[PDB]
Write a protein that binds this ligand. Structure first.
Ligand SMILES: NC(=O)c1ccccc1N1CCCCC1
Length: 284
């Protein structure tokens, strides 16, 4: 069923809360035993948001390999994503160790450091060129190279140095700065423009490690970003673009991380983004 007609049918019937609970009921439940070990309590932002054991990213260290991060591998679309929480005061060094070890080119940030008067993630990148950061625990140095501030997003060029080997890499930081403190954006135009800027950079392409995507918990806004990207790529690849079922794609992605799309409003917004984005994919 053409999702645009499914959309109007749910809107006119006002059944978004009903569709959303059906997804919550059918979603996968896999163990997260490593996340719940007592040694890892200060590595988790939220007691109720944990990576599954089968899909968790492992740090390359014998001491403690744990980070709250999941590998989402979309087989038919040929896209992979790492979804992670906003870094905590004790996990900024682990965060950049993961970027280094997984060979990522891009980091996508969908939250502000402060929202609703509370801290949603640590200031984990340098704000001035002349004031770089050194993570002693993971032996990494991070330098701000350049910053391009736009009305709806900021793009930063960062240099990450492995102080052990003196290898360096360029990382691109894509920061969506205008998601409202409550609810979802009224139009998906700025969010789709932002998704197309990340794609244009090479950060989502198979010559690099997976993109790192985060918000505060790494499931809600982060879920909307990967769901919209994957659905648009499948509409490009398939003979019948109307065969793309957003609910089935979301349940596939929930095999790899719990709780993706946190509200019925985020589910409606994901449908709107895919419907409006398809009007480019199909030749406009
Ligand atoms: N070890 C670090 O993470 C670190 C290193 C250099 C400068 C700042 C740093 N952080 C920033 C956000 C979390 C608290 C402290």
């Amino acid at each position: 069923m053409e999702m645009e007609k499914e959309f109007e049918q749910i809107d006119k019937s006002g059944s978004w809360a009903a569709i959303y609970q059906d997804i919550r009921h059918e979603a996968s439940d896999f163990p997260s035993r490593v996340a719940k070990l007592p040694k890892n309590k200060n590595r988790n932002r939220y007691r109720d948001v944990s990576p599954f054991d089968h899909s968790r990213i492992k740090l390359h260290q014998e001491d403690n390999d744990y980070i709250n991060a999941s590998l989402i591998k979309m087989e038919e679309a040929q896209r992979s994503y790492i979804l992670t929480q906003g870094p905590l005061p004790n996990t900024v060094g682990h965060f950049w160790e993961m970027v280094w070890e997984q060979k990522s080119r891009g980091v996508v940030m969908l939250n502000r450091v402060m929202e609703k008067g509370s801290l949603k993630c640590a200031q984990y990148w340098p704000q001035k060129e002349e004031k770089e950061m050194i993570f002693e625990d993971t032996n990494l140095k991070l330098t701000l190279i350049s910053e391009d501030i736009k009305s709806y997003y900021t793009v930063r060029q960062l240099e990450l140095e492995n102080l052990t080997t003196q290898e360096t890499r360029e990382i691109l930081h894509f920061h969506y700065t205008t998601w409202p403190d409550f609810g979802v954006p009224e139009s998906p135009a700025s969010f789709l423009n932002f998704l197309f800027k990340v794609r244009e950079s090479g950060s989502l392409s198979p010559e690099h490690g997976p993109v790192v995507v985060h918000c505060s918990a790494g499931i809600g806004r982060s879920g909307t970003f990967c769901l919209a990207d994957t659905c648009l790529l499948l509409m490009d690849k398939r003979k019948d673009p109307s065969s793309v079922d957003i609910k089935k794609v979301l349940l596939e992605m929930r095999k790899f991380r719990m709780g993706l799309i946190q509200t019925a409003d985020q589910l409606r917004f994901s449908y709107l983004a895919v419907i409006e984005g398809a009007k480019f994919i199909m030749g406009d």
